[PDB]
């Protein structure tokens, strides 16, 4: 329903479902440019689940995962970020 | 908790940070030795 139920859901993510989340009525290009490099200070210690450090970290890694996708085509499941 | 893997602000973490203090005067008890603590590290 919101792109914060598809970073918290597990499923396997295809073409389908890359195609039909990458548009921007979901997450706009802007946003989707700063979720790419702040996890660099977050993987460093833990924050809270509601908070950047964990919410927006979960949608850097799915941000990443999708420009993967993009750069790989390969169908692959989609997890919740490991804990450091 | 060694093996937890959620958030830092549940209950479950401030839990964790308990029991790793509990385990270190467990430890101090049994060995009298003056040791550094620091907050229970990512795991």
Same mark, same amino acid.
């Given at each position: 329903?919101?792109?914060?139920?598809?970073?918290?859901?597990?499923?396997?993510? #295809? =073409?389908?479902? /890359?195609?039909?989340?990458?548009? %921007?009525?979901?997450?706009?290009?802007?946003?989707?440019?700063?979720? !790419? $490099?702040?996890? #660099? =200070?977050?993987? /460093?210690?833990?924050?809270?689940? %509601?908070?950047?450090?964990?919410?927006?970290?979960?949608?850097?890694? !799915? $941000?990443?995962?999708?420009?993967?996708?993009?750069?790989?085509?390969?169908?692959?499941?989609?997890?919740?970020?490991?804990?450091?």
């Amino acid at each position: 329903s919101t792109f914060e139920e598809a970073a918290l859901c597990t499923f396997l993510l #295809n =073409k389908e479902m /890359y195609l039909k989340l990458r548009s %921007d009525v979901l997450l706009p290009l802007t946003q989707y440019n700063r979720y !790419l $490099a702040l996890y #660099n =200070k977050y993987k /460093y210690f833990s924050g809270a689940m %509601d908070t950047t450090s964990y919410r927006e970290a979960a949608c850097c890694h !799915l $941000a990443k995962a999708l420009n993967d996708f993009s750069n790989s085509g390969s169908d692959v499941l989609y997890q919740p970020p490991q804990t450091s």
